[PDB]
Structures are given as C-alpha cells and as structure tokens.
Design a protein around this nucleic acid. Structure first.
Lengths: 52, 122, 59, 50, 86, 134, 135
RNA sequence: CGCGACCUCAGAUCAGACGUGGCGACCCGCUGAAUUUAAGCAUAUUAGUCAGCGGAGGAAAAGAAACUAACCAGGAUUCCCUCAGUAACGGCGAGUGAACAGGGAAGAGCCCAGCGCCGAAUCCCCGCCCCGCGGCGGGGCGCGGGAAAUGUGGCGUACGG
RNA sequence: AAGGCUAAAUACCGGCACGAGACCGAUAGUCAACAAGUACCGUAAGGGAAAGUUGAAAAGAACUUUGAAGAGAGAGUUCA
RNA sequence: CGCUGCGGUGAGCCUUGAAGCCUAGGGCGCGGGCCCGGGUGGAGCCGCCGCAGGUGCAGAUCUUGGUGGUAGUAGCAAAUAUUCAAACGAGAACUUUGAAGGCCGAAGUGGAGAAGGGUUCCAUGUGAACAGCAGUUGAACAUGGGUCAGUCGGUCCUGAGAGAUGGGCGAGCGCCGUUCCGAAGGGACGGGCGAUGGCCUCCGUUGCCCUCAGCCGAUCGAAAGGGAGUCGGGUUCAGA
RNA sequence: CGACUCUUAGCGGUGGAUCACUCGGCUCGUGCGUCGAUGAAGAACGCAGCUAGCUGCGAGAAUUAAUGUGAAUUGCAGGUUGAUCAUCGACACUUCGAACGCACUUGCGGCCCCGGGUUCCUCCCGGGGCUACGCCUGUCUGAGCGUCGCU
C-alpha cells in the first residue's frame, strides 16, 4: 500500500548530535584516510582557505 | 502543371469551375485506365489529380465563404455557419459588456470609498 | 458500370446520357456482394455500344 | 438467407472484403512484425455472430 | 431430449444489430437494446460493472470532434484569425 | 547536470522520443561534423547532412581517406548511403551499406539559399557566446 | 407520506427494515413541487415557491421561475447571478429556500452533523484516516 | 344583436432565443441493502456504506449568526493540529462517538422585500444615424410598438435608516 | 428565524500536458510492452486470452548437385 | 548461509570475454553453501560496512507451461457392393472416362423452396497445412468471376398485440393508460371579393369571407393471412 | 561380446527455464482543468497505385488551405516559384446516434424555390431550402351565458 510508513522522524537534539560527531571526525586524519580519501599530501587536515 | 492554390485565388468564379470539371474528366479516364491494366505511370497520377481537385474545391469554398461573412459583416443576425463556434458552454456566458455592469449603488461605493494605497512604518 | 450505391436508375440514366453524349433505352442495377452497385445500361438502338466502349477506353 | 435486408447485405459485404490474406510486400517494410493475417474467418468454423 | 436434440430447433434470432451501440443486442420482440437501451434517450450504464463501462467510454472511439477541442483549447479557442502571410 | 525541470532525463523517455521523432526532427539528429578546413571557414561545428555532400567515413570497416558524396539520406533508418561505400551481395549485385552520420565528417557542403542562411546563423550565435563571455 | 415501493410488502431483510407504510420522505412536499416545475421547464431557473392552498389530497404551490436568457434578466446586475452556469437546476441539488430546509444545515449546537458543506461532508471528514507522513 | 375594452385560455413551420444527451476521479440532492461482527440471534453493528436515481462545476457545497458562551467574554464559511477515542450513545454487550475553547491556512463582505419619498423618474423590441463590429455593444433620433400602478427604477436593510 | 448573493484557504483513482521513483522486468508490472478490450465464447446481460529479442549491418545463403517437392550435400555471407 | 534493490567503499573485475548454463576436473566448510579448472556464451558483474524487502519450496485433488509411461495400444465395424480397362500423373483401392454388377425405389439417396448460413456458387491453379487412410480430388488454399424485374416478393393493410400525445401517477430514471378527465378536423364543395398566368379568352393558381363535416383515435405489427397487373421460346463457366 | 534393461558422460533432439536487455506498466507529485441542437460521446460504412488489420481520415476521404521548416517519402513502382515533416487559426466534415418531417423496412410524406419537363399546362425527373418535443419574450389569428362598457 502507499500508506506504508515511509518517513521517519529523529529528535532534533539527536540530529544536532550527529552533525557534531560528523564534523569532529573530519579533523582526525586516521578517520579520513579510512574513508578512502586520498589526502596524504593535504597541508593540514581541517583545511581552511581564505574567503577569496 | 502543378496546380498551386496561390494561382487560383485571383481567378474569377465560373472559370474555376471550368477547371474543376476538367480535372474531374481527367480523373474519370484515369480510373478507366486502372481497370484496363494501364501503365504504372498513369496509375500514380490519379493521386495527383485527386489532390488537385481538392485544392480547387478548397479555393472555391474559401472564396465563397469570405464573400458571405463580408456580406454579413454589419448585420445583426447572421447564419449559424458564420457565428463563432467555440465550446457551447462559453457561447452562453455573458458578454464582454454585461459582466462589466455595476449597479448605481455599487458604483457609488467605488467613487466614495476607493481602496487606498498605504504603508505602515516599522 | 460500377455506379455509386446511392444513385437511382434515373440518376444513372441522365449521367451516362450527359457524360458520353448518348441515349439510353433502360438501366438495370444490382448491388454486388462486395458492396458496390453495378448498372447494366442498355443503349438505344441508334447507338452501337461497341464503338462507344472504344471512345471511353474499355475493350 | 436469400431474403436479406440492405443493412445485413452491406454488413456481410464488409466481413467478406476483410477475409483476404495480407499482401506479400508488407513484411518488406522496416518495422514490420506481422507474419500473416490473424483475423481470417472461415465460413464453416467461425459463425460471424448474427 | 433437452440436450443435443433440442439444439436443432434454433432458427429464430431474438436479437439483432442495435443502431445506436452497434452491438447485436437489440431485442426484436421487446424493441429494446439490452446493451444501451436504445429507445430510451439515456445510455444504459451501471456501476456494478466497471469493466463494461471502460469498454464503451469517451476514449474508446475516434473522438473525431473532441480531440479537436483538446487542440483548440491550448490556444484559447481562437477564431477568425490566420497566421501572418509570407 | 541539468536543472530545467521540464527537460526529462529518463532513459525510456529519451529513447522513445528518439525512435519516434518526426521527419523534420530526424533531420536534426542526423547531423555530422564538418572537416577542420571547413570548421574555421564558416566558424560552425556541425551541420545536418543533405543528399549531395562530400563525405569521409572515420569509424567502422569503411573508414579511410576517400571522398564520396551522399546518394540518399534514409531518415527512417537513421542512416545515410555514401556512393562508394557498398558491399557485394550474394547474387553479384552491390548494395549500399548504411553509415551513421555521426561517424562521418563533411568535407564539402551542398550550398544553396536555405543552406547558407543556416551557416551564418550558426556562426552569428556562436560569436555571441564569445562576445558575452569575454 | 411515502410508502416503500416493494412488491406486496416483501422487504427481504431484517425486521428493523420491514416498514412499508409509515415512512416519510426526507424532503418537503414543497421541495418536490419545486423539482417538478423545474424538471418540466428545463430552460428556466427555479427561484422560490410558496403555498397557495391545500385540501385533503393536494397541496398547491406557485413556483417562481426566471428565464436566464431574457435581456431584462441578462442585463440587470442585481439578478444576473442566476444566469451563471453554477445555478443550473438549483432545485435538483437542494439549493432553493424550500430545498435547503431538508438538508438540516445551520449555525449552532443543533446542527453539528452538517459541519462542513453538508451531511456527507461531515461524514467524510469524520471517517477519514489522516495518515500523515511522519505519523 | 352589434361594437370595444379587459380577464382567463387556445393555435401557429409566427420573429428571436433557450433546455434535452455524454463524462462522472472530485462535488450536491435523494434512495438505500445484505454479507459481516456480536463466537447463536431479533435491537445494535456492518452503514447513511455498496448498488439505484437526479444535477453540476473547475472546483462544488457552505457562508456573513434566530452563533458560541457564562469568560475580565468571543464574532461568517471552509481546511489542518488539538480537543478525543473524550462528553455522550449502546441486548450500557459487541461496539459507536461529536462540539466549544486554543494554535494555524485563508480572510471580504454584501443585496432585496417591506416601511417611505420622488409626475414610471424603469425595462424589452423594432426603424434611422454614428462608433466598433469572430463575447452585437455604446451614443443619438423616433405622437414607433410593448412590458409595468396586481409596482419598474433611484435612495435605503437592522452595523440602524 | 421563516428572502438572496459572495472570492481565498479545501477535494480530485476521469481528461489534457508534464516530471519523478530504494517499484515490476514478459507466468512479473495494467486484462493489454505485440493488428488488446483484439482473437475467441455466450441468444443476451456479459466473459475475455495467448503472443517481446536473428545480426553491427540482410550481408536473409548466388551458383553446383540428388529429389515431383518438402528436404539435403557442397559453396558462400558474418567475429559467429 | 543464500536472493533482490539502496547509501558508502574496494585507484575492485570485464570484448585478452561479464551474467547465465554444462561438467567422470581440483578443493573448502558439521552444514546452509562456496571457491577454483575446463566447456559454452556474448555485456555487464561482484567483495566488504550499513540500509530495505513482494527474500529461500517437494507437497496445498496448488497455479501456468512442458513432457512421459500406458502405446504404435484402444481404436478407424449402424444403414447389402463392388469389379475390369484406359487417360492424366513423380505417384492411383479412393480422381476422370467407358463397361459391368448393385442400391435409393416417387412418404427417394430425385427435383425445388422457407428459416438459418454468408460466398460455401463458378472457373483456373496449387498440393504446405486441413478434409481422423490416401488423394492427381475438395465446401481446403491462391487468384479472378458471378445475383439485372412496373408484373416475383418487400414496400401497402390490419390481426393477436405493441405504443406515443392529452391525462394521471411518480424522489426520480420514468411508469400507467389507448379513448380514457381533451378547444384532438389544417380538409372539401359551392358562393362572394381581390389578384395573376397562358392567345391574363377561358381555365389554372392564390388570398379573404361564407357554407359543409361525425370522426375517433398518432404510429408500429405478417417475405405463409388481405393485396391491381407476365407469359412463351432462347441464352451463361455461374443469373433468369 | 549379443537384444533388451539400468546408471554415468559426450553429442544431437524435444522444450523454452535462466540470464541479460525494455518505445510497457505501477505509484507519487505538478500545472491546467476544455463536450453537445453551430449536431456531442458512441456506432456504422467508406477512403491508399499495389493495403487485410492497426493507425489516420470523410466523397475535398492515409487528407485541402495556411504558417513554420528546407530536400525528401521509401516495401516496390511512378513523379527550392518549396519535397517532406510538424504546427494548425481558413475550409470541409457520408449514415446512424440527445437525433429532429413520419416511420425504422431505409419505407412513405408535405411545403416552397430553381433546372430538365413544360414552354406554368398539369405532370414526371433531378437539385436546393424547410417540415421534432418542451419552454421564454414578443407578434398574429382566435375562443368564452368570465367581468363589463357603448349603442
């Protein structure tokens, strides 16, 4: 049927939790390598470039 | 001669008919050639004749119609052929004038209380 | 002739009389099983149908 | 029946002109899948209704 | 005798071609089409047969005058105009 | 990526519109690139192929440096017949092998009044892309 | 009243439905009048009706019709609402004054079973699962 | 008797119009079951549902309170969230079951009859003139015809006038 | 109260025209991917199928040979 | 363990051959299963971390499709009956001709029609399929042909009946009813007036007035009932 | 060794599973939201050089005109001052069908006007236009021991 429960709702604080855990893992080079990203020559992992 | 409709519209009426039956005649004897085992070349011509008869008939009908709706231009009643045929539902709607009719009372409101153009400050 | 299925013996008589400039004695019509109407047109004795067939092409 | 009406006779005329095989040259067309006429009615097997 | 022998006496049609729906369901003695109710002004249609509805509705035929309305609609039913000549 | 919401990207819809395109649309799909010597002469990339156009086959079994004019554009089969591109049948008669226009480079065009006005337009709007961008 | 049109009584159901005689029509006899006058003159538009007399077997009503294609009606802004196509056969849909009363609509606690458009509008909204996306 | 009004009522291939039939997903008005559940079954339930009949529209219907309330009060209709599986109904069994307040979407209000004033100040149609004339309309001129005093139009409707 | 009108928010398994999919992939998905409401069945109301795929391109096997022929043996086409 | 799809990931695999299928090949796992080799095939596929489910068949007198054993078997036995020679032909128990012997035996196995069938009629050609053996034949197949009316029927009439309008009923589609609650005749004669056309002669045409009227139930209902009037000879491959 | 029977494998048949394809569905969403007495929906019959179905079309019949497009269509033939496609606003649109002169056999009318037929003299033939029901406004002709008025 079409009225199967397709969508799900997650607590807003749990959504915000996951984004904090996602960003915080983007600063660990061992976790980004393990994701397969070829980043062995990036100067610094939390890569920041000027607003230009 | 490839009969083109650009070439027919300038001609007078009763000479178009003189050209119409001329093609009617040629179509008949072409149909006779179809049963008497005629050449393949003539058999392919009856399609040219058939579509040429449709052309001259089309010009005749068109020029006759526009002479009519030019004769019924300023008249009140006109034949049902010349009245605009568009979805019977909207042949029944009120005119472009009737639906614009406002009562003397309703007109008096617009003159007295027109909707103003304003703006509120922050 | 294979006439149109709507025509009468009267219309058929005056048609051949006008298309081929000939006189007709009588016309017998039947409706073929396939649908079209066949008309046997007997010419008046003063016209020979054998030559009339040559003017219109059938022979 | 030998006594027919013009409605019936004209109807039987149509069902008779439809009973022919397909012309040979049509399966020389490009996008042609037709192999033969699948609506051939035989007067003894299928009885045309009526 | 109610079987094979009695099928021999079948030589009288009750129905014939209705001249409104074309189906062979025009009952002769009752003078009424059992498929469209021909002498009745209104067409015979029932909701208890959805399948018999869709066999005969507005999209099954030619729509020789309705498929033109669908085309004239997408221009506002313009009339009396012609494209500018060459 | 495409962002126009009214342009489909469905595989089945694009193939249906391709295999059922009317004749005047078949003409556009059957376009061919021009040779390098013609590409900077008219400043035009590609062009729909006409009945009498000199042609080189670039891909397939008949590729080579031979020039051959088109003899017919079989739009129903999405294919063109080039004069010398033919094969031997069984009974000794030759038959034109069909080549797809995309696998063909135009070496000389069949100019006429209608053809020239196309080339200039494809060149006029091409310059707009270089005068608006630069 | 209205007796159930079934042959010889035979209401082959449960005893709650065996009634044949003391059944009453849901619409007034005046609303039946407006319908019969509107069905006969299909070209006209029923406006209202009123009581003009009765006896033991008949009620007489006078229905007020309007011909929506008369220029006196067509060109008058006060009455040209009746000319719109949405008012075709007001009496068949129960929109006249006499017809509205049988629908049981109005403001207040007495007319709860027609909140919404009508009695069917209320029933739908009350017997419809609103299965939201997220429940 | 005659003649003429008027009122009722007829006949026209009278002049000009309009209605019918289709579709029917959605909508409005009727009509309206029984399987089923109750571990049987008759009230209930299924259900104002299916079938049946009529009528529409691009939406329909509803709608500017003979309302809700009992507050320090709200303020047309429709829709959503909630009220609430609640008050209530019910072999008080099985089961059935709203509303107000509150938060939103949207938001728009109006017209007659009557009561009275104005010399019927009103409307339709024919003929002529002008303007446009595939939504036959506007203006003018007609001791041209008709409708209308058994009531047309303007003012004016409960917020008062 | 017992007369009337009124947009918007709302509904839409039909129609016209589009877009999409954690859907089905020819016994599935619509009954119907195909000359499908077709063939066919029934007096009728109605009931109602099966059926997609050569190859890149017909280049669809010239010619020889046995046979009345269907069919074979060679030869040939093709990456096959 | 296995199936299908989705988000990630394997600088994964693949026209130097993917999926699928076959296998007396080599092995792994208690097992579900899996991995190699070989063959076939010709264009896509898989591992791992998560996600999702129309996810695993031996059965349901299961559903659809296919194929066996039975089995070269039961069977091709109702209505007396065939034989010789020839021709055509690749080919004859069966076709055709001739002869012989028989049957139907005028309540026919004959000659014609109605209903029904709908091209089966006729000719030429073919022998794939079909005609439960065969076929040189056919009602099969493929090409073409063929049905002629004042007088024969239909058409007209009414029958048992059916069925509109008026009217009545009905929520309503509609129904009842057929002379019943009806202003139900659009005709005719003559006269009078006006008018026209053809030698406006005389007649025809028309309008108006006058005069007269029983009509009586619209309409449908018979290819056997009612119903004016065609017969003889000849002619075609098939129509008289 | 045989024949027959059984098992396994190769090959070949029968059969059409599997796999891979997909101009089809299914579901959700968006915009619009338009039939007909000016004859609809539906039905029938016709229409192509060779054409049965499907598709398209209506005796102007696989279409005419117009505009856009700019050299094909194609199974085989034939034949740029615009082929072919698309669009579609002009024109046309057979017979049934609400279906409309009456009937449903396509059967019988009636009226008016033209042309043969006359030489309007009645016919006959052909052609054209009309001839349905309900209802509205108006017109005309009427009816009534209905209510009156005047002679």
């Amino acid at each position: 049927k079409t009225w199967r429960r397709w969508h799900r709702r997650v607590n807003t604080t749990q959504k915000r939790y996951a984004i904090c855990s996602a960003l915080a893992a983007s600063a660990l080079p061992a976790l980004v390598m393990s994701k397969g990203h070829r980043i062995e020559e990036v100067p610094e992992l939390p890569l920041v470039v000027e607003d230009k | 001669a490839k009969i083109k409709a650009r070439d027919l519209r300038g001609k007078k009426k009763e000479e178009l008919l003189k050209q119409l039956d001329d093609l009617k005649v040629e179509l008949s004897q072409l149909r006779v050639a179809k049963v008497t085992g005629g050449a393949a070349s003539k058999l392919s011509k009856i399609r040219v004749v058939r579509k040429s008869i449709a052309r001259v008939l089309t010009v005749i009908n068109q020029t006759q119609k526009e002479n009519l709706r030019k004769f019924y231009k300023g008249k009140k009643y006109k034949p049902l052929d010349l009245r605009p045929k568009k979805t019977r539902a909207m042949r029944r709607r009120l005119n472009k004038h009737e639906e614009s009719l406002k009562t003397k009372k309703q007109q008096r409101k617009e003159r007295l209380y027109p909707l103003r153009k304003y703006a509120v400050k922050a | 002739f294979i006439v149109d299925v709507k025509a009468n013996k009267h219309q058929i008589k005056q048609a051949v009389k006008k298309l081929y400039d000939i006189d007709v004695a009588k016309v017998n019509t039947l409706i073929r099983p396939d649908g079209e109407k066949k008309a046997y047109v007997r010419l008046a004795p003063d016209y020979d149908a054998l030559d009339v067939a040559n003017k219109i092409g059938i022979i | 029946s030998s006594h027919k009406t013009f409605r019936i006779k004209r109807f039987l005329a149509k069902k008779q002109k439809q009973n022919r095989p397909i012309p040979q040259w049509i399966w020389m067309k490009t996008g042609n899948k037709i192999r033969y006429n699948s609506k051939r009615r035989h007067w003894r097997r299928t009885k045309l209704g009526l | 005798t109610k079987g094979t022998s009695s099928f021999g006496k079948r030589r009288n049609k009750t129905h014939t071609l209705c001249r409104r729906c074309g189906s062979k369901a025009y009952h002769l003695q009752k003078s009424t089409c059992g498929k469209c109710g021909y002498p009745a002004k209104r067409k015979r249609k029932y909701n208890w047969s959805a399948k018999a509805k869709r066999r005969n509705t507005t999209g099954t035929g030619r729509m020789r005058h309705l498929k033109i309305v669908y085309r004239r609609f997408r221009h506002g039913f313009r009339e009396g105009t012609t494209p500018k000549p060459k | 990526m495409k962002f126009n919401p009214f342009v489909t990207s469905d595989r089945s819809k694009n193939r249906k519109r391709h295999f059922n395109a009317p004749s005047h649309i078949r003409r556009k799909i059957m376009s061919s690139p021009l040779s390098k010597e013609l590409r900077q002469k008219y400043n035009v990339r590609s062009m729909p192929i006409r009945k009498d156009d000199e042609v080189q086959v670039v891909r397939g079994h008949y590729k080579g440096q031979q020039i051959g004019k088109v003899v017919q554009v079989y739009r129903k089969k999405y294919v063109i017949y080039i004069e010398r591109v033919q094969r031997e049948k069984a009974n000794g008669t030759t038959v034109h092998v069909g080549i797809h226009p995309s696998k063909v480079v135009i070496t000389r065009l069949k100019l006429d009044k209608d053809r020239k006005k196309i080339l200039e337009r494809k060149a006029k709007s091409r310059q707009v892309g270089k005068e608006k961008g630069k | 009243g209205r007796k159930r049109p079934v042959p010889k009584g035979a209401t082959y159901g449960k005893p709650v439905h065996h009634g044949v005689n003391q059944l009453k029509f849901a619409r007034s006899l005046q609303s039946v009048a407006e319908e019969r006058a509107g069905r006969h003159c299909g070209a006209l538009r029923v406006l209202n009706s009123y009581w003009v007399g009765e006896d033991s077997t008949y009620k007489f009503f006078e229905v007020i019709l309007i011909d929506p294609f008369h220029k006196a009606i067509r060109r008058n802004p006060d009455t040209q609402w009746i000319t719109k196509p949405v008012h075709k056969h007001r009496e068949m849909r129960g929109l006249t004054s006499a017809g509205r009363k049988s629908r049981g609509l109005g403001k207040g606690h007495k007319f709860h079973h027609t909140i919404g458009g009508s009695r069917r509008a209320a029933w739908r909204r009350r017997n419809t699962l609103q299965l939201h996306r997220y429940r």
